[PDB]
Amino acid sequence: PTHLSVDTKFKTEGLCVDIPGIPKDMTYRRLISMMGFKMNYQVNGYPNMFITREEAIRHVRAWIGFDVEGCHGTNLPLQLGFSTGVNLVAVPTPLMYKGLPWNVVRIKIVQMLSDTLKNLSDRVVFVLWAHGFELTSMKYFVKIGPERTCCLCDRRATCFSTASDTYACWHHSIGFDYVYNPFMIDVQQWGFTGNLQSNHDLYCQVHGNAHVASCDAIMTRCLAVHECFVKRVDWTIEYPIIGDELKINAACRKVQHMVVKAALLADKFPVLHDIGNPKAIKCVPQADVEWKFYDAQPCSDKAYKIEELFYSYHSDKFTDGVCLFWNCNVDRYPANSIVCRFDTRVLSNLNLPGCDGGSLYVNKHAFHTPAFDKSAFVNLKQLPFFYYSDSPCESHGIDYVPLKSATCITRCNLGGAVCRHHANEYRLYLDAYNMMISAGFSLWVYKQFDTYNLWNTFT
Ligand SMILES: CNS(=O)(=O)CC1CCCCC1
Ligand SMILES: CNS(=O)(=O)CC1CCCCC1
Ligand SMILES: [Zn+2]
Numbered sequence: 001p002t003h004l005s006v007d008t009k010f011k012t013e014g015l016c017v018d019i020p021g022i023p024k025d026m027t028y029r030r031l032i033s034m035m036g037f038k039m040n041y042q043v044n045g046y047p048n049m050f051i052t053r054e055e056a057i058r059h060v061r062a063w064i065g066f067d068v069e070g071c072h073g074t075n076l077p078l079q080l081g082f083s084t085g086v087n088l089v090a091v092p093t094p095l096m097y098k099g100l101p102w103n104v105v106r107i108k109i110v111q112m113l114s115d116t117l118k119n120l121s122d123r124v125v126f127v128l129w130a131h132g133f134e135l136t137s138m139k140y141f142v143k144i145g146p147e148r149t150c151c152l153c154d155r156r157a158t159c160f161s162t163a164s165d166t167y168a169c170w171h172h173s174i175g176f177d178y179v180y181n182p183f184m185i186d187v188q189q190w191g192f193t194g195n196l197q198s199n200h201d202l203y204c205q206v207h208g209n210a211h212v213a214s215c216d217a218i219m220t221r222c223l224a225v226h227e228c229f230v231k232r233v234d235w236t237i238e239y240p241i242i243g244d245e246l247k248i249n250a251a252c253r254k255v256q257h258m259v260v261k262a263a264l265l266a267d268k269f270p271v272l273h274d275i276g277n278p279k280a281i282k283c284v285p286q287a288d289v290e291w292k293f294y295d296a297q298p299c300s301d302k303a304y305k306i307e308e309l310f311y312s313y314h315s316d317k318f319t320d321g322v323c324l325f326w327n328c329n330v331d332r333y334p335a336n337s338i339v340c341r342f343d344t345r346v347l348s349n350l351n352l353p354g355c356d357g358g359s360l361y362v363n364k365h366a367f368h369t370p371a372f373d374k375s376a377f378v379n380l381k382q383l384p385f386f387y388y389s390d391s392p393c394e395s396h397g398i399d400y401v402p403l404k405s406a407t408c409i410t411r412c413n414l415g416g417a418v419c420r421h422h423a424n425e426y427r428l429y430l431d432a433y434n435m436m437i438s439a440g441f442s443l444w445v446y447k448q449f450d451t452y453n454l455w456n457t458f459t
């Protein structure tokens with residue numbers, strides 16, 4: 001069992017206000033037929049338009065919430081809303097577009113999905129809170145058939161053009177008018193009491209209800225992210241590489257080693273309390289310090305309360321030495337800390353919008369991360385950029401312009417002229433550091449941290 005059987009039952013109660021008289025006994029096979037689509041007994045990679053909760057989770061990057069509200073259904077205008085904030089009015093003749101016929105609305109849908117999804121996913125998963133009008137509108141902008149490849153590349157086809165009779169992926173679909181082989185999931189099938197707003201509002205105060213289709217589309221997708229990534233967490237699911245994942249992760253390890261090594265050299269803490277990932281390894285293995293670990297998985301709902309991580313009776317004395325919180329998100333860091341905190345507000349192909357101000361950071365695994373809160377850092381200050389090295393000044397083995405920088409903390413710089421080796425390493429470090437920052441990571445440190453204390457570690 002990998003795909004959703006078309007013979008699975010579909011609960012129709014949520015559809016009966018838009019579709020009165022709808023049979024209670026209903027399968028996906030009959031529903032797809034009712035929606036105006038014919039599967040023709042085809043074994044060509046597309047067994048069902050609808051997918052399981054598990055298939056949806058693996059394809060979370062493709063999720064686009066979708067809602068259709070009857071503006072006035074054959075004779076009435078429809079308002080199509082998407083979790084991108086777009087509202088389109090389709091006449092059968094928070095962005096709000098005036099009423100237009102389906103032939104032009106479909107081009108806008110294809111353009112919007114393609115620009116939203118080309119750098120995220122090989123597909124689209126329409127996330128529904130199905131009431132009827134959204135399912136019956138699909139025939140006006142969706143075409144289905146065998147799984148196909150793009151006409152200009154090797155990627156799977158996501159769009160079709162009636163002008164050229166050709167197929168394209170999200171990257172080569174300019175001027176295309178049909179969404180081809182989309183996927184969908186009805187959140188109402190999961191078992192809920194009450195309407196969308198009542199279930200959504202139980203976990204989120206950031207998305208309101210301005211009474212438009214896009215608001216419902218946003219709440220639907222938010223509710224789905226809550227159920228799949230906030231209340232339930234699965235770190236066994238791998239996600240494909242779509243960007244700078246490897247460079248970002250490598251940069252994070254480089255910066256962590258640099259910062260902790262320098263804090264230990266500058267302030268000589270006798271003990272380090274490493275709080276976070278239960279699979280953490282000493283980031284400065286050659287350091288003298290008593291290294292003590294404390295297990296905490298990444299918090300996916302609210303930030304950890306420091307009182308619960310530290311109290312209720314370990315070294316016991318977290319006030320001794322320094323505390324290292326490398327992506328261990330707490331409500332208020334103690335004054336003696338070294339912190340890396342992901343900024344959920346960051347715009348990137350890895351960072352998806354999440355629940356209640358949180359974001360869904362997807363890099364190898366999916367991590368729902370609680371909203372970035374500037375007040376968590378009141379006892380600390382921003383960590384300034386610096387490169388420190390005690391390695392020998394020796395080239396070994398790319399061209400050169402002499403490096404002049406006050407933040408290159410090396411013997412050669414102290415001696416008045418940065419060596420080629422330390423200039424190369426400084427520039428590589430600066431690139432890694434800028435990569436980490438741009439990815440959304442933020443660095444904080446105890447207020448007494450001063451890189452002037454590193455110069456005397458060269459005697
Ligand atoms: C120990 N967690 S991790 O470093 O694997 C991923 C983090 C990514 C950014 C948000 C917190 C979790
Ligand atoms: C050339 N300008 S500079 O500010 O980079 C001089 C360095 C001398 C050694 C300490 C760091 C600063
Ligand atoms: Zn293509």
Ligand SMILES: [Zn+2]
Binds near residue numbers: 207219222354
């Ligand atoms: Zn929400």
Ligand SMILES: [Zn+2]
Binds near residue numbers: 394410411412421
């Ligand atoms: Zn040097």
